[PDB]
Design a protein around this ligand. Sequence first.
Ligand SMILES: O=P(O)(O)C(O)(c1cccc(-c2cccc(-c3ccccc3)c2)c1)P(=O)(O)O
Lengths: 277, 282
Amino acid sequence: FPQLPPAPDDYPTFPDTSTWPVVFPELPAAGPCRPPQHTSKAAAPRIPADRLPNHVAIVMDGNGRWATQRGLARTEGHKMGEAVVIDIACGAIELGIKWLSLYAFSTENWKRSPEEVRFLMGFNRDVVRRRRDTLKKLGVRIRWVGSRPRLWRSVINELAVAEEMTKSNDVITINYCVNYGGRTEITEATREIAREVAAGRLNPERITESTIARHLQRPDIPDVDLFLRTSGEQRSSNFMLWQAAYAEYIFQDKLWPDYDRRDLWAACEEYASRTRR
Amino acid sequence: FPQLPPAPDDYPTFPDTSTWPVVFPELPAAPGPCRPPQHTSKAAAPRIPADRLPNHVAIVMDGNGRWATQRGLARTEGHKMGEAVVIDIACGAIELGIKWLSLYAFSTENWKRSPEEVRFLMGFNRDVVRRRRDTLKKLGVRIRWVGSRPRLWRSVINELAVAEEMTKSNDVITINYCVNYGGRTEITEATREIAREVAAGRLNPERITESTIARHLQRPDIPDVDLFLRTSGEQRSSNFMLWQAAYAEYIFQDKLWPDYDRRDLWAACEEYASRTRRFGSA
Ligand SMILES: O=P(O)(O)C(O)(c1cccc(-c2cccc(-c3ccccc3)c2)c1)P(=O)(O)O
């Protein structure tokens, strides 16, 4: 039962949405720190290890519907979404999930207005810079997954720093997927394979499903167990395409800025129920 | 509105599942493909405009063994009942105007079942194709196999290869009958072919694009899946049409495959046609 037990009543909480960016609380010093509990003070459900998803992937959908209901720009929905990412990371640690893949920026987003794309590049750069120390302290290992063309060098470089600083952590790994597309990533694995073949380092007849797996950008990513998408949308949208071929999908109706760790836990309790059915 | 109109009231119905194999009725001549028999309920396809219909539906046929188990029957009986369901779905797809239909008959994962289950399923798929190939031809269905050659029985490939040759000029609907199919495997096989072309100095690695992978899949004419359906409450894509379904809409239906009929296909298609299409979606 790999859950952290309920925090003491007085242990720090997260998120305090009275400031933007939300200020992550000081924690008592431990190794990694125990993450703050949710503001509701709910505790993670008891799910046995062999029924827990090892790897959860999340498409964080609904930020513009959320902002539209409030007469705000979509960028306000993105802003509120930053604290939900952190809260979900805290929740995932409390529950004992080991891998979390987050679809921060699809290759499809290049169709959005250039002003919004520029905001999202800047914003993802800033989130990583602003949260890198908090992630390090909680024992998160983070790194970039995605494709290089068009992506701002500053975002790649900022994740590269957070990956270097968190390389030894092992409480949870977050794949922070930026300019990511599943077909694109498989096509890059195939290009790599092709380079190795043009070079005579690899025999085409030896190519198997493992060869593709070994040549993906991050070959250490395990299969996705549980694939989640918010806002009621029931598509995988090319996210973790290779890795989620055998995933279970749980499509939830809440909009991402309204989501919190208790919703992640409820999807994980459902996933654990289906290990029986 | 590319639906066929409601059929005449005395137009032949299908399926009558009181006998096995199920009888497919004689149909009046055309000129041209025959109009499919209407469902036993005589329901007519809903009027969904062409711009809101899926061009390509993929279906995993789930729950055959669970269905037979609930009735205390051998699991082979659920499979046998799913044959008429495949044909009924093909007739309802034609009535609705669907142009592409992919059916997941046997997965690369299925070699993990017992030898007796595998022999049964390989032999039963061979037999379905033989039994139904003339009927599909008469309905203007273009049918062909999609899947991986290693392990797959040569008798299955042979029956599908003749069905493919018999129906190659048909154009009412294409059915990809997917047997020993695994999406990662089909991508690996495309990557092998690309690698062969590179080793032969015919393709340069820096000219490889997503299109190159698409052009080297086994059947490169298959369009993207617009609507991906599971039955029996399964909520996974199980490696089916993995490259082609990357942007599909998923609907996970509860009904077991042997209980399924063309009205369930139409209802999933009505649900798909109603979904709001969000920013940037094809
Ligand atoms: O997924 P988002 O909520 O960011 C989205 O749905 C979105 C982004 C920005 C604005 C909206 C939007 C625009 C116009 C109307 C509405 C709407 C909201 C609630 C009820 C009816 C319409 C929502 C919707 P998108 O996938 O189309 O980009």
